[PDB]
C-alpha cells in the first residue's frame, strides 16, 4: 500500500513523521499481513491555511490519511484498519482523533507496481 498523508508544514517535526509512518505501517501489517517494506508513507505538507472545513479556514492541526490499497478486503477489515490508524496516529502525532480523516481507495493488483515490480 501507499498512504498519502496530508498535513500542514511544521506541525510534525521530523521525529513524529517517523512515529506516524511507523504507526500507520504497523497497523497495516498487523491487520492485513502485508509485509513491512511494502507500505509507503508519503507525507504531503502544505502551508498553514490551505485546509477548509465547510468553507471555514483551518489552522495546522488537520491530518488527512488517504490509503491506496489493493482490492478485495472485507468491509469489517477495512473498518478495523481505519479505526486503528485514527487511534495510532492520534497518539503518534499528539493530536485528537477529531482532527484525523481516513479514506481508502482500492485498485486491482495487476495495475499496482512497487519497487519497479508488479504485485
Amino acid at each position: 500500500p501507499v498512504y498519502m498523508v496530508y498535513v500542514s508544514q511544521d506541525r510534525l517535526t521530523p521525529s513524529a513523521k517517523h512515529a506516524v509512518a511507523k504507526a500507520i505501517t504497523d497497523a497495516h501489517r498487523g491487520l492485513t499481513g502485508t509485509q513491512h517494506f511494502l507500505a509507503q508513507v508519503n507525507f504531503q505538507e502544505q502551508p498553514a491555511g490551505n485546509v477548509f472545513l465547510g468553507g471555514v479556514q483551518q489552522g495546522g492541526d488537520t491530518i488527512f490519511v488517504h490509503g491506496l490499497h489493493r482490492e478485495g478486503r472485507s468491509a469489517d477489515l477495512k473498518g478495523q484498519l481505519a479505526q486503528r490508524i485514527v487511534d495510532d496516529v492520534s497518539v503518534a502525532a499528539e493530536i485528537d482523533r477529531k482532527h484525523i480523516w481516513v479514506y481508502f481507495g482500492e485498485m486491482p493488483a495487476q495495475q499496482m507496481v512497487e519497487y519497479g515490480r508488479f504485485l
Copy 2:
C-alpha cells in the same frame, strides 16, 4: 467529501482560496444534501512550471479539482456537480473554464472517516 484542489503557488491569494473552497462546498451541499462541515477543501500548491499538458509545460493558471466521494450517486447527479464546480470555481478564481479540470473518485462509505468518525 474531500476535494483535493491542485493549483500553482501565488495564483490564488488567501482571499480567493476561501472563495473557491466556498464555491466548491456550496455546490456540493446544494446538489447532494451533504451538510456543510462535511466537505473538506485541501489546496495543494506547487511551483509554477510543475504542470504539463501533452508534454508541454504550463504556467500558473491550471486548476485540477479531484473530489473523493462516497459511492452511490447517479451519473446525472455527478455530472451536474462537476459542471457546477467548473462554473463556480471559474468565477470564484477569476479563471476561464478551459483551465479547470474536475475528476471524481468514489469509495464505500464504510471505509470513510471524517472527524475521527465513520460515515
Copy 3:
C-alpha cells in the same frame, strides 16, 4: 488522463521534469490511443525525508506515479502501460526501476472533466 507524479524537491531539474512528462505522455498515447493534449502530468514535489518505506525514512530518489484513468481498459493493457512507464521514466529521470512505483485509479468517463469539458 491525469498523472500525479510524487518526487522529492531538487531531484529533477526543470529539464528532466519535461523528459518524464514526455515519457509518461508518449507511453500513454502510444498504448491507449488517447491524444497527446489529453494527458496531464502534475509533479508534486516535497522535501527530502518525506517518504517512508516500512517505517524507514528515504532520501530523494523515490518516484510514485499515480495515474487517474477512465475505466474500461483490459488488464493486459494497463499492465503494459505500467511497465512502459516504469522503464521510460527510469531512463528519462536517470533512476533505477527499483525506485519507481506506479498505481492506477479508474473512474467513469461521465465524471471526468478536462479543459472545462466532459469526456
